[PDB]
C-alpha cells in the first residue's frame, strides 16, 4: 500500500526521505520520548521513531513522535505533511490544503470491506487488558495522566447507522480498562454522543485506531461537513477506497492496516477527571483537571511491531499548528466562497498559535461588489464565527492579493501597516468562543463566548479605485532591468547566494 | 580613533569583521546602488561600500549602504549596531539600548573644539555648488527626487544658543543650491524651526553632517529630551568628548572627522515640493509630493575619498526598524519608570514594522498595586501616547516577565494567547497619530489623530495571585535530569547540532 494509505508505508517513506531517526537505544515513555519529540518540533528536526520503548511487551509498542511537524529545509518544509497525501516533499501549504479540500466537489469513494488485515495480527481481550501496564507516554511533566491518545482516530457512528465520524480528540489512561478524554461542543464526536444520549443509550459503541492511513488522520483533523462520513471523503482525496475490517467486539469498522485498535464504549452517563494537558496554545495548568467522558476498552488488536504515534504538542511547531489551524483555515476559505465572499486563499499563520486565520481577497472582485471595509469585516465575521469551522479561530485578518497569506512575514506586515487598530476592526462578543485559549478560560470575560475580531487589513482605496502604492522592496521599487543587473552581479561581487 | 568615534574607522571595523563588500565595479547612483542595498537589507548580508559611483567627481563621493542593518549570523545579528557603540559584535539588542540609555543618568561630557579636521580637506562654495550634478542616489524608483539625506545628522540651534539639536530627517535635492525635507511636529528640528519663525528669522543657521561618529548618528535617531543637546549625551555614551570644528560660513559646530558637511540655512518661509519617499513602513505612494521647507547650501566641505552613507529603507530589515522604533522603545521604558509604572524593559518587535512596542512588566511589583489589566492599560497609554517618544508607536503590548520582549516569537506568542481581542485592549481615538502609516494617511479616519491601542497580554491571575501555568516547551515541561539526558544523547542519536 502506498504511504498515504498505510502508516507503516508512511514511516518507511520518511526513512527513505532521510526525515526519520531510528532510536534503537532504550527510551523511557515517562517524559523522555516526549522531551526528544518536543525538541524535534522546536527545531524542525527529523521525526523520531522510538524502536525500544522501556516497558514495551509482546509488540506494544514503538512510538513515532512528530508525525506531521515541519522539516528544516525551506524547499521541503511541509514534506512530512505531503507524505500523508501522495504529494511531493516540495509541496506548498496551499497544495496540501487544496488537496484536502479536493473531495468537497466530487463524489465520495466509499470504503471497501476486507475480512482481515495486519491490525488483526495480535489481540488482548477483557480482563487481560491493563492500560496502566502499557507504555503510554507522559507527554508533559504537569499532565494529569498518560496521554496514550494524541494522534489516533476515534470512530463513532450515529444511531441510524448512516454517519460514521472519524476525528482526533485527546484522551489519557484513567484506569485498568478506561480512558478519559475531551468530547466538546461543537465537535462531531460530541454531536453523536448527544444523539445517543437523547435515545437513552448509556454506553456507545466506539473504536480508537492508532497509526491509521495518513490521508485518514488528516481528514480526522479536518472539520468536513456535518453528517459526512470521513471514510468516503478520504477515499475521494486518495482516488481509491480505504480498506476497512470489522471490529471483533462491535459492529464498527477500522482501517485494516491500522497499527493498534482499541474497541469499547464511550459513556453518556459517566465522567472522570481529565487533564490538565500541555495543549495547542503552548500552556499547561498544573493541577487543573476537569470532568470528561469515560471510554471503556474491551479489546485491543494490533500489528506485529506496532507503532503508537504521538504529538508532543505545545509551543511552535507541532501537529496542532500544522494541522488544526491550517485545516480549519481551508474550511473557512470554502465557507467564505460558498457565502459569496471574494476569498481566494486562507491560512493559519504560525505566529497566531492556531488562533488566527488570514483571508486573501480577490480585490478586482471586491471592487465589483462596491462595499467598504467596515461593512465587509462585519459580514466576514458573521459568516465565519457562527459556524463550526470558525470555532477555534479568534482573529480573522483580511488582506489584499499582493499579500502571500501562507507567509507569516507578509501577513504581519499587512496587519501592522493596513489595519488601523480599533477603527478597522469589528469585535464579536456574542459568538461561541474557544475556552481552551488562556485569555478565554483564564481571562477577564466569559470563557465560552466572544473574544473574536475581524481585522480589515485592506487599505481604503482597495475597496474603490485600486492599489495606489508601490512596496518599498527589491521586487517592486526597482525596474526589472536593475533587478536583473543586481542578481547577475550578486555572487561575483561577494554577496551570499 | 576608534570605530564608535570615526565613521572612517567604523568602515574599517566592518571590513575587519568580514561585514563589508568593497564594490570596485561601477554602480549607478540612479537606483542600482539602492537596489543592491535593499537586497542586502532583505537578506541580512554584508554592508555594500560603493567605491566607484557613476558620476563621482572631485572626490564626491563613495556610498556606504545598510550602515546599521542586520547580520545573518544569529550570534552577531546586531554586530553592525554594536560597532557604532564600542560594544562587541555579539552584543544583544538589550545591550545596545541599555548603552544608549546609560547617558541620561550621568553628567554630559561636553564636546571639545579643534581648529580643523579631516572634514576641512576639500571644499566647494557658493556659485560653484551644483547639488543636481552630484551623484545623489535615487533610492526607490517612485521617489520624488534624489534622497541625498537618509543617514546624516542635521545640526540646528535654538535662538537662545543653549540647545544644539542633532537629528536624522530625510531630505532630497530640490535645486542647484537647495534641499527639501521633512520638518514635522513633534520633532526637535521643527520645534526649533518654529522658535525661529516666532521671532521673525527668515534663514536659520544649519548644517548637515554625513558620516558622523557612529555614536553621534545613534543619538541623532534617539528621542532624548527637549532642550538636551545631543553632543554632551553622545560624549557620555562614548566615555569622552566628540571633537567639533566650527563651520566656515556660520557659528554651528560639526564633528571634525565627518565625511561631508553641508553648511547653509533652513528657511522659515520658503517651501518646495518634497517626496514621495519609500519609507519605514514599506510603502511609497507614486506622485504624492507635499510642500516641505527649503534648506539652502552655501558651502560643502569634505574628507579626501569622502563616503555618503545611505539607508535604502522599506520592508524589513533596515535602519528605520533597527534604530527608530528601538530607540523610541528605550525612551518609552524610561518614561514609564519616571511615571512609576512597573516596566523593566521595552523593545520594538520587527514584525510591527516600527509601529509596535512591547513593554515588560515586573509582575511582583504589579501584584503589589492590586490593579487590573483594563485600568493598567489605560494608564500606560495615557502616559506614553501624549508624549513625543510615543508619537510613532500605535500599539503597545504589555507582557509579563516570563516573556523576552527582545524576541518577536515570544512577543507574538504572548499577544496571540494572553490578550483577548477588544476585551483586553484600550483604544485611543484622541491622541496624536502618525500620519505616515498607510492606515492613517490613506485610511478610514483622521490622518493625524487616534488609531492607537494598548493590548493587555498579561493573563488575569498575573495582576492578583501570580503565574499559574507552565509553558508546554522543552525548557519548562521536562525536568532538568531529562533535558540533560536528551541534550547529552542528541547528536549521537542523529539529530542536528
Ligand atoms: C491534529 C490534532 C487535532 C486535535 C487535537 C490534537 C491533534 C494533534 C491533540 C494533540 C490531541 C490535542 C487536542 O486538543 N486535540 C483535540 C482536537 N479536537 C478536540 O475536540 N479535542 C482535542 O482534544 N483536535 C482537533 C480536531 O481533530 C478537529 O477539530 C476535527 O475537525 C474534529 O473532527 P470533526 O468533529 O469535525 O469530525
Ligand atoms: C534612523 C532614521 C531616523 C529617521 C529617519 C530615517 C532614518 C534612517 C530615514 C531613512 C531618513 C527615514 C525618515 O523618515 N527619517 C526621519 C526621521 N524623523 C523625522 O522627523 N523625519 C524623517 O524623515 N527619523 C527618526 C528621527 O531621527 C528620530 O525620531 C529622532 O529621535 C529625532 O531627533 P529629535 O527630534 O528627538 O532630536
Ligand atoms: K474530522
Ligand atoms: K484598513
Ligand atoms: K536626536
Ligand atoms: K489579558
Ligand atoms: Mn466529522
Ligand atoms: Mn533632540
Numbering used by the authors:
A (entry chain A), B (entry chain B): 14 to 510
Give the article text:
The prenylated flavin (prFMN)-dependent ferulic acid decarboxylases (Fdc) catalyse reversible non-oxidative (de)carboxylation of a range of acrylic acids with extended conjugation. The final step in the pathway consists of the decarboxylation of 3-methylcrotonic acid, catalysed by an evolved ferulic acid decarboxylase (Fdc) enzyme. Herein, we report on discovery and optimization through directed evolution of Fdc decarboxylation activity with 3-methylcrotonic acid to produce isobutene. Recently, a reversible 1,3-dipolar cycloaddition mechanism was conclusively shown to underpin catalysis in Aspergillus niger Fdc (AnFdc).
TaFdcV generated by 4 rounds of evolution has 11 mutations: E25N, N31G, G305A, D351R, K377H, P402V, F404Y, T405M, T429A, V445P and Q448W. In order to understand how TaFdcV mutations aid in isobutene production, crystal structures of TaFdc and TaFdcV were solved at a resolution of 1.74 and 1.89 Å, respectively. An overlay of the wild-type and the variant crystal structures shows that the key residues F447, Q200 and the catalytic network of E287–R183–E292 are unaffected by the mutations. The T405M mutation is located at the active site, extending towards the space above the prFMN uracil ring while the Q448W and F404Y mutations are situated in the second shell from the active site. The mobile E292 and L449 gate access to the active site while the Q448W mutation in TaFdcV narrows the binding pocket. The T405M and Q448W mutations are likely to be responsible for the increased selectivity for 3-methylcrotonic acid in TaFdcV by enhancing the substrate/active site shape complementarity, blocking access to larger substrates. In contrast, the TaFdcV variant showed compromised activity with sorbic acid (kobs = 0.33 ± 0.03 s−1) and no activity was detected with cinnamic acid. Directed evolution of TaFdc to TaFdcV resulted in a marked increase in activity with 3-methylcrotonic acid.
